[PDB]
Coordinates of C-alpha atoms and ligand atoms in Angstrom, one line a residue:
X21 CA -25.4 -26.8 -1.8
X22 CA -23.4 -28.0 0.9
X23 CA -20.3 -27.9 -1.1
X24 CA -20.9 -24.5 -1.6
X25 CA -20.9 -23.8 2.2
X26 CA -17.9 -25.5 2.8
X27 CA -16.1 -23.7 0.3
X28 CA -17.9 -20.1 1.3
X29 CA -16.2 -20.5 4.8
X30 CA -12.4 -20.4 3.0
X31 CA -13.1 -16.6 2.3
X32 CA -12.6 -15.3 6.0
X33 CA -9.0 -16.2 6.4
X34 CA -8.3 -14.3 3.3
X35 CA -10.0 -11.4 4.2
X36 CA -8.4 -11.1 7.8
X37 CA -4.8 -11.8 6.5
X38 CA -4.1 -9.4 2.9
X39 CA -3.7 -6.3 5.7
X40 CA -3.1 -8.6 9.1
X41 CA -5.4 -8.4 11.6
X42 CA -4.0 -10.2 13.9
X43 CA -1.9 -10.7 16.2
X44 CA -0.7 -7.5 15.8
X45 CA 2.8 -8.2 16.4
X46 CA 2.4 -10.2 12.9
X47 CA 0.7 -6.6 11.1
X48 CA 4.2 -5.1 12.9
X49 CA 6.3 -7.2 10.8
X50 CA 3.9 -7.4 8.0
X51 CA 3.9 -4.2 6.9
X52 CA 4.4 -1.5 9.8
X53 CA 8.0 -1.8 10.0
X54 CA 8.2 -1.5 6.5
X55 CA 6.0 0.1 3.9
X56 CA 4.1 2.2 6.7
X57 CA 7.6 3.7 7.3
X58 CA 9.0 3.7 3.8
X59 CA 5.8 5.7 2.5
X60 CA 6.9 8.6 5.1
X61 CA 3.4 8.0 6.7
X62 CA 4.3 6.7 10.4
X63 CA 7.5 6.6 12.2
X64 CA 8.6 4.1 15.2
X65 CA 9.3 6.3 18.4
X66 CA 11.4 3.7 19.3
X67 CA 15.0 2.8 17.3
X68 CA 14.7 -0.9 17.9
X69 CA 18.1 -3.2 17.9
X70 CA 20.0 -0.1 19.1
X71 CA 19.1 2.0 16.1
X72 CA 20.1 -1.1 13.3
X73 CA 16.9 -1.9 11.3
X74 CA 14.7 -1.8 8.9
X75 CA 14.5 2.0 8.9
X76 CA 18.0 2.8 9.0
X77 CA 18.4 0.1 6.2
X78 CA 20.2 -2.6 8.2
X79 CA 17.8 -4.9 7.4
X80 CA 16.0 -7.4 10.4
X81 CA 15.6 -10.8 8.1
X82 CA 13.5 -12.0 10.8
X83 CA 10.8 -9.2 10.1
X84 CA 10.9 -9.1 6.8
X85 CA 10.2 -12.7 6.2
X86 CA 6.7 -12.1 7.9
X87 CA 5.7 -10.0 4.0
X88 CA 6.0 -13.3 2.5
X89 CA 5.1 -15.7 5.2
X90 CA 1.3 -13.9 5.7
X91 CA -0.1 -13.9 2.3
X92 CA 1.7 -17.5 1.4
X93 CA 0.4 -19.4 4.9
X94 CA -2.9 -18.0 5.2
X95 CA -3.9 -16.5 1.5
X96 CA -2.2 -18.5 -1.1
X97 CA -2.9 -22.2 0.4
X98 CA -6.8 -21.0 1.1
X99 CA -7.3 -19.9 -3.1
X100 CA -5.2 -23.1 -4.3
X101 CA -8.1 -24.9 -2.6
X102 CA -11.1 -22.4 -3.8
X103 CA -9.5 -23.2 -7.3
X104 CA -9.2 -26.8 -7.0
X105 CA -12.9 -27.1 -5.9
X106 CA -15.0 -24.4 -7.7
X107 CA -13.2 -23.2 -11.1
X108 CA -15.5 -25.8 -12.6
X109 CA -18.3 -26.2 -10.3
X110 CA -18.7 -23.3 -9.0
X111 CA -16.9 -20.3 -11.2
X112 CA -18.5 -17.3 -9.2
X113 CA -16.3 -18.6 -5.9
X114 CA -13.3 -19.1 -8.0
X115 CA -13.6 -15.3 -9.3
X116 CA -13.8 -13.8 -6.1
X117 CA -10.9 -15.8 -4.9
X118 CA -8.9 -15.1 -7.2
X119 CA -9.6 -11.3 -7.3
X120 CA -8.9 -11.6 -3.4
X121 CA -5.7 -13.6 -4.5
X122 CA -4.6 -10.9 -6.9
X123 CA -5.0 -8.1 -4.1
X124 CA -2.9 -10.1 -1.8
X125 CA 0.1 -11.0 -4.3
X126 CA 1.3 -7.8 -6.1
X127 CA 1.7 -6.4 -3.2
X128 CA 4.2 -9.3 -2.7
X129 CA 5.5 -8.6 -6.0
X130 CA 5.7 -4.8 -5.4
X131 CA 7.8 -5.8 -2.5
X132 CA 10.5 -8.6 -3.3
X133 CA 9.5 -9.1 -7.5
X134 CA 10.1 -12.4 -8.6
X135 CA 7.3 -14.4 -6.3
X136 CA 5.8 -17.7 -6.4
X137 CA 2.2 -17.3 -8.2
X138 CA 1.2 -19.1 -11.1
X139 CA 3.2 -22.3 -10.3
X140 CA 2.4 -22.1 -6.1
X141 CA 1.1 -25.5 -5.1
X142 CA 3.5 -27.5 -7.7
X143 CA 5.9 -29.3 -5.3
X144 CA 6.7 -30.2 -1.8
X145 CA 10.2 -30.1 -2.5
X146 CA 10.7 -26.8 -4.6
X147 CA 8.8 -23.8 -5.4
X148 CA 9.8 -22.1 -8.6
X149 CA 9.1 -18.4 -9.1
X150 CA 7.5 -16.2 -11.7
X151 CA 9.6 -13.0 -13.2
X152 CA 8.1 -9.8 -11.3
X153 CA 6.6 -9.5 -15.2
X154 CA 5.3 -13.0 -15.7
X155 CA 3.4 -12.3 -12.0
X156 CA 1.8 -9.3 -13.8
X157 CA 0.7 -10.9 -16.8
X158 CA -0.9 -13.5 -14.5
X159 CA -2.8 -10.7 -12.3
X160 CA -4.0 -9.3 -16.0
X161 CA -5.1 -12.5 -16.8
X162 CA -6.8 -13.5 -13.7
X163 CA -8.7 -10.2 -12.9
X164 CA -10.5 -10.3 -16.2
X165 CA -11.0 -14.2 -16.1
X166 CA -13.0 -13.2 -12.9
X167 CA -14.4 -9.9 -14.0
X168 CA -15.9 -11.7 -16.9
X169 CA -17.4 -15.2 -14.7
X170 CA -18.8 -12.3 -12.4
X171 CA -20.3 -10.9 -15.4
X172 CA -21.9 -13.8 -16.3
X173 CA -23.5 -14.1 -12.6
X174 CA -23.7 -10.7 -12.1
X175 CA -26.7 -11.2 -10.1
X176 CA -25.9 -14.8 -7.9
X177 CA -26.6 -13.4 -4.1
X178 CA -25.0 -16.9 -3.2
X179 CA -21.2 -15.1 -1.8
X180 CA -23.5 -13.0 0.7
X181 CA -22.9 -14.9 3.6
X182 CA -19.1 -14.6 3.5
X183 CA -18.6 -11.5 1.7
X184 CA -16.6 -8.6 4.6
X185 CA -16.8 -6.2 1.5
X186 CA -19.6 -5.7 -0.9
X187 CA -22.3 -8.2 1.0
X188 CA -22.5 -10.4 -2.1
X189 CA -23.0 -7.7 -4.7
X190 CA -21.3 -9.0 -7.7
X191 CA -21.8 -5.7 -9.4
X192 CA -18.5 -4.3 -6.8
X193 CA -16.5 -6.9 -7.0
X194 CA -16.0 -6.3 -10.7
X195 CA -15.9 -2.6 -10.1
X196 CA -12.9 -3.7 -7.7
X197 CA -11.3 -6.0 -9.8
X198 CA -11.3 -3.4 -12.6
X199 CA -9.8 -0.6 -10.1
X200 CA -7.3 -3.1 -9.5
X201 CA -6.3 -4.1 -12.9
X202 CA -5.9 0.1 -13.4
X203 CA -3.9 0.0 -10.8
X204 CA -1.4 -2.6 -12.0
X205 CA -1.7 -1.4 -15.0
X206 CA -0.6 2.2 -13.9
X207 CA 2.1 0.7 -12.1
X208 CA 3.6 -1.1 -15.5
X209 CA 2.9 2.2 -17.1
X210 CA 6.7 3.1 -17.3
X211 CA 8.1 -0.1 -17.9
X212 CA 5.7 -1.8 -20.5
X213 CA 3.9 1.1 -21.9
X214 CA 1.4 -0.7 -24.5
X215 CA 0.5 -3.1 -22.5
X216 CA -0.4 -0.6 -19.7
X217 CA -2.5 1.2 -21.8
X218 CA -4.2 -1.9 -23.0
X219 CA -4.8 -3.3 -19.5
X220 CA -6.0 0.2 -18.4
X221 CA -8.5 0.8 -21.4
X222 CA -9.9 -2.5 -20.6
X223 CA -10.8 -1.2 -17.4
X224 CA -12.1 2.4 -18.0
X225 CA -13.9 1.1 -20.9
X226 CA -15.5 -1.7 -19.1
X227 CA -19.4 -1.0 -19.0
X228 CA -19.8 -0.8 -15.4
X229 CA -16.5 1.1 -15.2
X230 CA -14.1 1.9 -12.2
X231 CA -15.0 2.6 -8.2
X232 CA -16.0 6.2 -8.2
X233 CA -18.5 6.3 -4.8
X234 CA -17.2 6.1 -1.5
X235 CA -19.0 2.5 -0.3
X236 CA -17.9 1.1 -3.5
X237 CA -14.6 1.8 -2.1
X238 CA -12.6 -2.2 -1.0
X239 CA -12.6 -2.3 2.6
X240 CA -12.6 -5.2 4.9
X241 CA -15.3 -5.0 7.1
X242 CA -14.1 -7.2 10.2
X243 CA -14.8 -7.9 13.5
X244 CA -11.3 -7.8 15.2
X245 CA -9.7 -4.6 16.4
X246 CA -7.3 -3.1 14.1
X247 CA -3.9 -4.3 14.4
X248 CA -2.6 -0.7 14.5
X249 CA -4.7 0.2 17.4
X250 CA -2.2 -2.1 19.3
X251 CA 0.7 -0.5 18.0
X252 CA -0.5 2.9 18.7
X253 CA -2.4 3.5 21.3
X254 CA -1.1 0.1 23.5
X255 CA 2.4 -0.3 22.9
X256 CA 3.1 3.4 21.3
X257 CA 5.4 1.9 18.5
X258 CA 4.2 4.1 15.9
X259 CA 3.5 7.9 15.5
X260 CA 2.9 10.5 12.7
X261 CA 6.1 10.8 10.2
X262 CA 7.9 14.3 9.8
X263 CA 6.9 14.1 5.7
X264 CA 3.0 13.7 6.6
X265 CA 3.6 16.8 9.3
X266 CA 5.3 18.8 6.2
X267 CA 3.2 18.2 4.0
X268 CA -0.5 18.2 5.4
X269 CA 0.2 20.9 7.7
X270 CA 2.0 23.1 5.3
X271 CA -1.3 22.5 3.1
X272 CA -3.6 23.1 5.6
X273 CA -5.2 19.9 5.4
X274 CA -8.2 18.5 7.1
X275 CA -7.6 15.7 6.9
X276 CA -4.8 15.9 9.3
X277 CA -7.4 15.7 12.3
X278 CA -9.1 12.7 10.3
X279 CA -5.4 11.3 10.3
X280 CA -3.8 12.5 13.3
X281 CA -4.1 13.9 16.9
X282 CA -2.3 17.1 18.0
X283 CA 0.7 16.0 19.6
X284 CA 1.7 16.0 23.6
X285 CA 5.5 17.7 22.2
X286 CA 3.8 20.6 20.9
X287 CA 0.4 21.4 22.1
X288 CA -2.3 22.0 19.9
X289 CA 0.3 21.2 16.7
X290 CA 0.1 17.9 15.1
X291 CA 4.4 16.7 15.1
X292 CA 5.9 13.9 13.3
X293 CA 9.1 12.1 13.1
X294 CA 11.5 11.4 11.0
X295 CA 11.8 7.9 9.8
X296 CA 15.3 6.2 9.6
X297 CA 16.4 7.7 13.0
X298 CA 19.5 6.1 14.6
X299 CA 19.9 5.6 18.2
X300 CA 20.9 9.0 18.6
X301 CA 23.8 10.6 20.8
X302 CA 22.1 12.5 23.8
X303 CA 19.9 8.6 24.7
X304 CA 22.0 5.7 26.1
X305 CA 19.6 3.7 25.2
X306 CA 16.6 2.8 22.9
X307 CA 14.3 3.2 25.5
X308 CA 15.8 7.1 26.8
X309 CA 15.1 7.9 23.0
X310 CA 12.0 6.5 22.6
X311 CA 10.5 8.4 25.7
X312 CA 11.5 11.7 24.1
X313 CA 9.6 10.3 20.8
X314 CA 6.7 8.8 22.0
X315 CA 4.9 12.5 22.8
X316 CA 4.9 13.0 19.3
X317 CA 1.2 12.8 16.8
X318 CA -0.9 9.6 18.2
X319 CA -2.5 8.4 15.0
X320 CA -6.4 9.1 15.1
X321 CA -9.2 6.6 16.0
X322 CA -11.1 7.7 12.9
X323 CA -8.8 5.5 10.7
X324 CA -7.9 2.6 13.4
X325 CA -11.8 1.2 13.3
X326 CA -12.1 -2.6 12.8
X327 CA -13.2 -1.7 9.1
X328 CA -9.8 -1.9 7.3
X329 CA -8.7 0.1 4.2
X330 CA -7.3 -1.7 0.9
X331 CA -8.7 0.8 -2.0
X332 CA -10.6 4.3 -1.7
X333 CA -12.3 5.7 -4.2
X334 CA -10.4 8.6 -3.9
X335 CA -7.5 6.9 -5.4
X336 CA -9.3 5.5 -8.0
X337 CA -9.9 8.8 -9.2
X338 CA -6.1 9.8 -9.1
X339 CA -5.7 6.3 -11.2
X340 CA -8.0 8.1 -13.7
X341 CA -5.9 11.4 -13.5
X342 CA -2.3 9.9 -14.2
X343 CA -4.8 7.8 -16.9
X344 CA -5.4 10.5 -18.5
X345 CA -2.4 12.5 -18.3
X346 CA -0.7 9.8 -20.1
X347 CA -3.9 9.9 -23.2
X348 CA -5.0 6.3 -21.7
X349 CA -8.8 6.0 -24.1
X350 CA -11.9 6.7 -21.8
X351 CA -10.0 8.3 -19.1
X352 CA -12.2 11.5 -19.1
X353 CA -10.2 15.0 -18.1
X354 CA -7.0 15.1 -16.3
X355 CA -7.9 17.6 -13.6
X356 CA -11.4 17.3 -13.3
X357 CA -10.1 13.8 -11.7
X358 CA -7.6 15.2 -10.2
X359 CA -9.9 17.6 -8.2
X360 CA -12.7 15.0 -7.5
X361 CA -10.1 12.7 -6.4
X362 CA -9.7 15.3 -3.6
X363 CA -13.1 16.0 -3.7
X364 CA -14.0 12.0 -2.3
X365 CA -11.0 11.5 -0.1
X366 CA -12.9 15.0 1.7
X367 CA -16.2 13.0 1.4
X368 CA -14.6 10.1 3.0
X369 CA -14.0 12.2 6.3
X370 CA -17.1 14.1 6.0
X371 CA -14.9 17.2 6.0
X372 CA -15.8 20.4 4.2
X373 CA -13.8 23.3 3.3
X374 CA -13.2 21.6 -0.2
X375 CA -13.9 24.3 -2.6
X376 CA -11.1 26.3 -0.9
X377 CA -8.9 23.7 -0.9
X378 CA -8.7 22.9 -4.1
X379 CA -8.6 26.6 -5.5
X380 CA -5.3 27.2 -3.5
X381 CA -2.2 28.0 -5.0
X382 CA -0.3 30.0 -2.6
X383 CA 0.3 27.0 0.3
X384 CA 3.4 24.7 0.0
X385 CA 4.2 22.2 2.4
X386 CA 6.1 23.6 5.4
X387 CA 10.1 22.8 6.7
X388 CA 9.8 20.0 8.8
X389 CA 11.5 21.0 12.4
X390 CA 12.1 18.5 15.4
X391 CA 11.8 20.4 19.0
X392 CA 13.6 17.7 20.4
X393 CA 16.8 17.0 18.5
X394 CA 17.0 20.1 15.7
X395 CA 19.6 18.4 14.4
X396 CA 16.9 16.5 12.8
X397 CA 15.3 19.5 10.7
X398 CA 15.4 19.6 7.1
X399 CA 13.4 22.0 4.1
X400 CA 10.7 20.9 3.1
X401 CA 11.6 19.0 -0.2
X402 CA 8.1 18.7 -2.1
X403 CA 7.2 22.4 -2.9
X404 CA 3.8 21.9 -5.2
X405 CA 0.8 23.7 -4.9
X406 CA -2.4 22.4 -4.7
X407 CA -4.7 24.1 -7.4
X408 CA -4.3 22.0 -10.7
X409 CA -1.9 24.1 -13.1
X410 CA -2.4 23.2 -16.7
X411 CA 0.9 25.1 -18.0
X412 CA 2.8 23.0 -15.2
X413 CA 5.2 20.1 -16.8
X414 CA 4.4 16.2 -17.2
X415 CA 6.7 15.7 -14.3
X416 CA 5.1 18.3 -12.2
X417 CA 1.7 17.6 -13.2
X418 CA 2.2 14.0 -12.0
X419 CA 3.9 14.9 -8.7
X420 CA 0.6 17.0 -8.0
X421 CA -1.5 13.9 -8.8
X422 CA 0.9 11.7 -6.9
X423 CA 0.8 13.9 -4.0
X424 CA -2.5 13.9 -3.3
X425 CA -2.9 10.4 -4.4
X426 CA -0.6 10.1 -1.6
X427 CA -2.5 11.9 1.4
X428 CA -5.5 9.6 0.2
X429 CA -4.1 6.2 0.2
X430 CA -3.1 6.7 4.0
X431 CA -3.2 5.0 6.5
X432 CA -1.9 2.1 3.3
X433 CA 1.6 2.2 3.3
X434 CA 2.4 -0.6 1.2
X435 CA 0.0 1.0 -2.1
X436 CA 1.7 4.5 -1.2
X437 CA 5.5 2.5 -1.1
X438 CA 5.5 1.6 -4.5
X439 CA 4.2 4.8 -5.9
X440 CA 7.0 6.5 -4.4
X441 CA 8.8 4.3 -5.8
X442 CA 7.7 3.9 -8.7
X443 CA 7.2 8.1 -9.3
X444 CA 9.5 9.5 -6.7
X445 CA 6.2 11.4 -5.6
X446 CA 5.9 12.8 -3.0
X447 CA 9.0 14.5 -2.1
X448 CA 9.5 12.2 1.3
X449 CA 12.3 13.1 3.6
X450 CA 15.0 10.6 3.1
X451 CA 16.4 8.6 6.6
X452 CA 18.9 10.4 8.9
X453 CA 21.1 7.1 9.4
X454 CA 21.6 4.8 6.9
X455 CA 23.3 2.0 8.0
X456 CA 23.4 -0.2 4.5
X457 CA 27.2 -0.2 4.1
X458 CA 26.1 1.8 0.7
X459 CA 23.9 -1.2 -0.5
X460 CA 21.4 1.4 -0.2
X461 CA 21.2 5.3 -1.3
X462 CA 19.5 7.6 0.5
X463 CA 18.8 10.0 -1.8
X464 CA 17.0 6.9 -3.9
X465 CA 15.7 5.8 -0.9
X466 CA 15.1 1.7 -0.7
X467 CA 14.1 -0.2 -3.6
X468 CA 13.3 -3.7 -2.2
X469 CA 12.9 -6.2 0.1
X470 CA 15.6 -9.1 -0.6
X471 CA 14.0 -12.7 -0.9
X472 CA 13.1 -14.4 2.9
X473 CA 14.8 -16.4 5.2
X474 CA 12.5 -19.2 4.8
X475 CA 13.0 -19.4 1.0
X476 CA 17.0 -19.3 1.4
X477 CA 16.2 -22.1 4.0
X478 CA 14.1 -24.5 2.4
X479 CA 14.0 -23.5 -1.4
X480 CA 17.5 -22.6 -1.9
X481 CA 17.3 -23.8 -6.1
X482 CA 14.1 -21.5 -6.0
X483 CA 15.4 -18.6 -4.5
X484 CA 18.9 -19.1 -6.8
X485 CA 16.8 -18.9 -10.0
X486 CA 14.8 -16.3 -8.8
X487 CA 17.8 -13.9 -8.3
X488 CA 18.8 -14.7 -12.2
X489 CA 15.0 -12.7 -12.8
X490 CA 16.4 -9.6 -10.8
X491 CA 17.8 -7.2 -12.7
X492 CA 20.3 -6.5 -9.7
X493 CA 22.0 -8.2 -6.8
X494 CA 19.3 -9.6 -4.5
X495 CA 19.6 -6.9 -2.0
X496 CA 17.4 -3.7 -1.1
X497 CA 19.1 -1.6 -3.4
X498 CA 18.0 -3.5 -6.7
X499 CA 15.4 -1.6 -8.6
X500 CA 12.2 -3.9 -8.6
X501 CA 11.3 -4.8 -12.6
X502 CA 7.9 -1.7 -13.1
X503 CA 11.0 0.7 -11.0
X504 CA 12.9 2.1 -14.1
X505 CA 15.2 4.9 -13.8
X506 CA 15.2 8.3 -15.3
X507 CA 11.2 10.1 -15.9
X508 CA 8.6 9.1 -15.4
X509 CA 7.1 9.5 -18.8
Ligands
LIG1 C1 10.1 -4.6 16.7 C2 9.7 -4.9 18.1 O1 10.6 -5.2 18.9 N1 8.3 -5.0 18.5 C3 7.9 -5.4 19.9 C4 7.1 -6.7 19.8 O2 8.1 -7.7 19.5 C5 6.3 -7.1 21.0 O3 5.4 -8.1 20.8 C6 5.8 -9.4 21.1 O4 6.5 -9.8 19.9 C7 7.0 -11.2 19.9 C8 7.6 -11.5 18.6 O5 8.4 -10.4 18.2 C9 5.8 -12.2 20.2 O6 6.4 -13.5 20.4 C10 6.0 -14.4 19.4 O7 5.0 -15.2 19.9 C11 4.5 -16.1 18.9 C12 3.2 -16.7 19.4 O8 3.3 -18.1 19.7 C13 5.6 -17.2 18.7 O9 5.2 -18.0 17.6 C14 6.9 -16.6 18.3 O10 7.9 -17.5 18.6 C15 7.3 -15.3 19.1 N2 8.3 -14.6 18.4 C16 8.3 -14.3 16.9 C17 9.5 -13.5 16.3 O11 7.5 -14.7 16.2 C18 5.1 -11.7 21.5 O12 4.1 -12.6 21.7 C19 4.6 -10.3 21.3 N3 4.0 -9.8 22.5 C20 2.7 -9.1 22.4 C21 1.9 -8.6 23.6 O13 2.2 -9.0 21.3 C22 5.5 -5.8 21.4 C23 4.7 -6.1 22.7 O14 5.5 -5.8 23.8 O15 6.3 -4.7 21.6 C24 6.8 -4.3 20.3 O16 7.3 -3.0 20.3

């Protein structure tokens, strides 16, 4: 019994560290700076290192090695030890840490694709990394090992005590665990096609099913503040991008106020930026710029709680649209998810007005205009409608589910990144500068994140046989292994 309690007190660290709590300098680099730009949901007021970053695709290797540095010091190390301990004695803790586990890696693969996963742990002189595919057939593998020891103790109220999710009901975590697995195996859909319809009947099929209510949705509920409180409303490093303005605006969206505040730039009008921004002309400095920038849509309170978002229900639902487009067994009928996935991302906000919403066919998203620099405006690129159009093309018919997959997912940017990605949906502005030397398109927008500092320091064999399981030069450019070129179907 006391083993039990020294092992339930492991959880808390993972929780706190998939999306960083804290500090929130940590989150910045994390994710902020990347996928939370990359998705076209926020954009930094503020072109740090004169105007040569992330953004503008002059990659900072000093951020970027914080995505791998999080999840491998504080997540990784915590369910080596949960294994070691309880996949004999006690296979209920196992589960859970490796369905935490799972939720923390592929969004490591989705960002650098070879990664160190089923042989972490080996050596204190190398680390030797899975293919971006082996790391998927080991998150198959591991989310129904643990859906099916849940099963089995489908009823054990012994993870209550450390559980910031579900409260120690087993019956959600396997709900979660198959949501995720339909997610990865959406995600493989183009690439490996029967096994992406295998792993995603397994799931739909699964007797207790997918997430489909909104407090079965995977949240963390913590204590400390979110870390993007810090960045918005103390240090005013992040505000609403110019593609969320287009596109919720133009659609009239609700959720816009559940997302955003109006802006200081343009009273009563909700303004974002666009991402990728160089240290523009008329600012001598960084600074100048920024204070022209940081007037610009605040990010709302609503969705900056200490109760931090990893999986909606809405999305789920959207899972089960693209499911079902693609004749997945079990999926149920393409837009009647489609429109329920609207339907609970409303529910979510407690917003009405859905029946409208979803019967509208005339509103596109609007041409994004910058009052300060109109050098920065662009047409709107995405120009789908909202009301589900059966006669509409696969592509089309995916864009619309990707969309509003999309608005739902926020404030997530790292899910959202790789389904752009992934789909090319939504239509995202692409940056203003890009600084890449051409190592990066900007019409394809960036692909990667190119393998850490810390690796090229201290696992220099690893990292060199890692880059032989790219199927490019290890640089932002390279099309991760699920990224395939051409349509989507
Ligand atoms: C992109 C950008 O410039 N963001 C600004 C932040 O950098 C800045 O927060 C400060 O960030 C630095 C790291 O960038 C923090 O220093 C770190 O402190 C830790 C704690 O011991 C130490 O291990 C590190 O050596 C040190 N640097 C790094 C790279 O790890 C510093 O504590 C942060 N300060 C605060 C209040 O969070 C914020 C705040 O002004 O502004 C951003 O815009």
């Amino acid at each position: 019994e006391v083993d039990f309690q020294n092992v339930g007190s492991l959880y808390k660290p993972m929780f706190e560290n998939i999306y960083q709590y804290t500090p929130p300098w940590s989150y910045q680099l994390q994710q902020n700076l990347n996928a939370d730009v990359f998705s076209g949901y926020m954009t930094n007021p503020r072109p740090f290192v004169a105007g040569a970053n992330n953004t503008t695709y002059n990659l900072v290797s000093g951020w970027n090695n914080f995505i791998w540095s999080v999840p491998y010091s504080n997540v990784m190390n915590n369910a080596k030890t949960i294994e070691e301990e309880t996949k004999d004695e006690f296979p209920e803790l196992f589960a859970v840490s490796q369905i935490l586990k799972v939720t923390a890696m592929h969004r490591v693969a989705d960002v650098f694709g070879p990664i160190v996963y089923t042989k972490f742990g080996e050596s204190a002189t190398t680390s030797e990394y899975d293919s971006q595919e082996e790391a998927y057939n080991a998150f198959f593998n591991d989310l129904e090992e643990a859906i099916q020891i849940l099963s089995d103790n489908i009823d054990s109220p012994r993870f209550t005590a450390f559980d910031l999710a579900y409260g120690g009901n087993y019956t959600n975590w396997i709900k979660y665990a198959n949501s995720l697995r339909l997610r990865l195996a959406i995600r493989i859909s183009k690439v490996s096609p029967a096994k992406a319809k295998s792993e995603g009947e397994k799931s739909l099929n699964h007797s207790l099913g997918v997430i489909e209510t909104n407090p079965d949705g995977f949240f963390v509920n913590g204590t400390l503040d979110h870390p993007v409180r810090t960045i918005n409303n103390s240090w005013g490093d992040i505000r609403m991008n110019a593609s969320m303005e287009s596109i919720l605006v133009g659609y009239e969206d609700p959720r816009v106020d559940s997302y955003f505040n109006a802006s200081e730039v343009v009273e009563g009008e909700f303004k974002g930026i666009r991402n990728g921004l160089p240290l523009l002309s008329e600012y001598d400095d960084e600074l100048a710029q920024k204070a022209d920038y940081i007037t610009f849509s605040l990010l709302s309170d609503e969705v900056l709680t200490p109760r931090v978002q990893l999986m909606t229900a809405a999305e789920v639902f959207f899972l089960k649209a693209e499911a079902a487009l693609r004749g997945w067994s079990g999926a149920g009928d393409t837009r009647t998810n489609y429109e329920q996935g609207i339907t609970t991302s409303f529910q979510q906000y407690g917003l009405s007005g859905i029946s409208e919403y979803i019967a509208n066919n005339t509103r596109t998203p609007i041409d994004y205009v910058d009052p300060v620099t109109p050098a920065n405006n662009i047409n709107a690129l995405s120009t789908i409608t909202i009301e589900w159009d059966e006669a509409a093309s696969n592509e089309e018919k995916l864009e619309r589910i990707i969309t509003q997959k999309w608005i739902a997912l926020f404030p997530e940017g790292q899910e959202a990144w790789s389904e752009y990605r992934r789909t090319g949906y939504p239509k995202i502005f692409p940056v203003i500068s890009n600084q890449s030397g051409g190592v990066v398109d900007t019409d394809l927008q960036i692909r990667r994140i190119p393998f850490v500092d810390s690796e090229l320091q201290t696992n220099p064999d690893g990292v060199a046989d890692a880059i032989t399981k790219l199927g490019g030069p290890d640089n932002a450019g390279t099309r991760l292994w699920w990224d395939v070129p051409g349509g989507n179907f």
